[PDB]
Design a protein around this ligand. Structure first.
Ligand SMILES: NC(=O)c1ccc[n+]([C@@H]2O[C@H](COP(=O)([O-])OP(=O)(O)OC[C@H]3O[C@@H](n4cnc5c(N)ncnc54)[C@H](O)[C@@H]3O)[C@@H](O)[C@H]2O)c1
Ligand SMILES: NC(=O)c1ccc[n+]([C@@H]2O[C@H](COP(=O)([O-])OP(=O)(O)OC[C@H]3O[C@@H](n4cnc5c(N)ncnc54)[C@H](O)[C@@H]3O)[C@@H](O)[C@H]2O)c1
Ligand SMILES: C[C@@H](N)[C@H](CCCCCC(=O)O)CC(=O)O
Ligand SMILES: C[C@@H](N)[C@H](CCCCCC(=O)O)CC(=O)O
Lengths: 327, 327
């Protein structure tokens, strides 16, 4: 509260906006920086969040806000100008290489500090693994898969694993309730890509009408099984189990602000007594996706600052570190 | 497996013996050292666990084993002789000052490395807090409350808290099934002290007959509510909630190797959207107390080594650190 972390959000959609509302009441963390595709907003006194959302929703960028600046290289521009201790990357991974590219920008920028993502795909995370040395060398502490899943649920699994001699499966079943699907376009596009008939490239090309059409077949309900989720590699990287033992599935109701099922992770293992058993970590039906994603993200930004401060640089997952409650 | 942690166990009761069985199949960790009240056993090739248990059970000390040495200052002696990277303190906290005293021994010993306890009482932990600077200065990384509760459940709570703006309660309800109460004498004596009619001093003085008599009133079933559990201060120390928001209760069936209820922690908070909700982390009914205690203990020894290695010394709780799966 005397020396507060100055933090930025890149991307101002469902997650970016929700991140900004979540940081509003904090005293240890101050939102100084937001960027979207076409513009950015910096204010070392703290972002008027209501104004940044008004600007974004009605004029299509935060660059159109009281303090905003338009730019077709918003993040590139914001990096040089902004005195910022850590950024949350609330961005799409469209294409599957985009997060890595922005991270490359940050590496080349010379900039030092903490980065956090809520990256979902094993493949997207592997691209970030590509950069783990570069990351260390540029003096960046990078916290990857630090949302809900990956993130909170992965970390719960890493903690639960401690009871066992060998891990057998980590099963994630998530439920999401959103009032309409446009609230989290990329989240829902990235979901449709996981589906049987589809991929990343197809999902990207699809029109808002084609998405509503698909959704309409099932009354707004995406059932997703064995999705390509980075929970798998993070748990492997922590040496808890092989990625093949990690399985991620769920149900998105896109016409319903209420969760269609209780999000839970089941951790199955054999104890040193040769008994086989399962721990269950279940989320409260009234913890929203945004809460379950952005809450851990900033806890991981803080833990990441902890690590940065004792000169720890490189790539950490939600599985590797205890996030620190942000006040 | 090339460079394995050499670890010791102080105390060879229910937990100490179970610790030794748990470390048997590990390749990253080698049991080199065990101490009980009257003797100790060192063997830098690894303890024959079956022999140490035979010696203890039938001749009353591990000092009576193939390699053993009798001593009425077993731990004092074992410290000087033993090349050991980390110790698990499987000891009673009778009297409520005993853990602190042994820790003082370790401080005065000059010895460097990692210590772990499964300490249960807020008061016992406060005594260890007394020593946090001494601990740092002697070059010891000390992991306190790193069993089941405190420990695993506390850590699960710290992770679950991340979804929330404010924490309202952490409620722990534990179930324990043991075939007879003498398996974990001090555990059960420490329990009876928490009870309404009793205290530490009374519990200590009580005879094995007086304990069986008490237990016999309720057919071997201790119901315990609002116990003085260090979960409370650890969560406060991690700045997640005030100790008064943390509440620990449970049921020990002392005539039943099956859990009388499913151990769980409920974490209640308000999200940034002003919604109030609860996460639940439940343990599998076939994870034993020993598994749920010793598994996290050694995960925390390893994490503690991690911290020691980057020159981090002092007092950490299960709430402050991600334990590392031991292989
Ligand atoms: N880990 C988890 O638990 C978790 C959960 C949900 C979503 N996610 C992921 O989080 C990401 C964000 O999803 P969302 O629903 O907030 O997305 P969204 O489509 O609602 O918003 C994307 C935002 O990115 C902005 N942006 C900023 N700079 C950009 C640039 N240079 N190019 C393109 N867009 C730019 C856009 O303007 C837009 O505001 C997705 O990839 C999603 O899969 C992770
Ligand atoms: N954190 C948790 O989840 C958790 C759970 C269960 C028990 N515990 C705690 O763990 C502790 C161990 O309980 P237990 O059931 O293994 O105890 P126990 O009574 O079965 O064994 C105690 C052992 O301490 C040994 N010991 C070694 N050196 C000693 C010395 N100098 N003085 C006295 N005894 C000495 C005794 O010889 C004996 O082997 C208790 O304090 C208990 O409350 C914690
Ligand atoms: C966007 C959804 N399809 C997933 C939701 C994970 C968060 C939900 C957990 C909860 O709040 O219960 C996350 C993802 O897919 O990356
Ligand atoms: C000994 C008992 N009275 C408690 C049991 C905590 C571990 C049980 C959790 C479980 O395995 O379900 C621990 C304690 O009291 O310190």
């Amino acid at each position: 509260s005397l020396a507060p972390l100055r933090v930025g959000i890149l991307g101002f959609g469902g997650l970016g906006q929700a991140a900004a509302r979540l940081l509003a009441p904090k005293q240890e963390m101050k939102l100084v920086a937001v960027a979207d595709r076409h513009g950015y907003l910096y204010d070392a006194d703290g972002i008027d969040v209501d104004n940044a959302v008004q600007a974004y929703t009605q004029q299509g960028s935060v660059g159109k806000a009281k303090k905003g600046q338009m730019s077709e290289q918003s993040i590139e521009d914001l990096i040089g100008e902004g005195e910022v201790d850590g950024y949350f990357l609330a961005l799409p991974n469209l294409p599957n290489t985009f997060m890595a590219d922005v991270t490359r920008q940050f590496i080349a920028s010379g900039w030092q500090g903490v980065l956090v993502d809520a990256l979902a795909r094993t493949s997207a995370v592997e691209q970030l693994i590509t950069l783990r040395e570069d990351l260390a060398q540029a003096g960046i502490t990078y916290m990857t898969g630090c949302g809900a899943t990956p993130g909170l649920l992965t970390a719960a699994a890493a903690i639960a694993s401690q009871s066992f001699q060998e891990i057998h499966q980590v099963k994630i079943t998530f439920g999401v309730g959103i009032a309409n699907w446009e609230a989290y376009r990329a989240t829902i596009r990235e979901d449709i890509a996981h589906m049987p008939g589809y991929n990343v490239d197809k999902a990207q090309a699809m029109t808002d009408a084609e998405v509503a059409a698909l959704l309409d077949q099932t009354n707004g309900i995406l059932a997703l099984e064995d999705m390509e989720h980075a929970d798998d590699i993070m748990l492997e990287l922590a040496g808890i189990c092989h990625r093949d033992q990690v399985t991620v599935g769920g149900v998105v109701d896109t016409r319903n602000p209420k969760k269609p099922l209780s999000t839970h992770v089941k951790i199955t293992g054999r104890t040193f007594e040769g008994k086989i058993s399962s721990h269950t970590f279940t989320l409260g039906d009234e913890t929203s996706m945004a809460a379950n994603v952005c809450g851990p993200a900033f806890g991981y930004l803080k833990a990441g600052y902890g690590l940065h401060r004792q000169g720890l640089k490189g790539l950490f997952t939600a599985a590797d570190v205890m996030p620190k409650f942000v006040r």
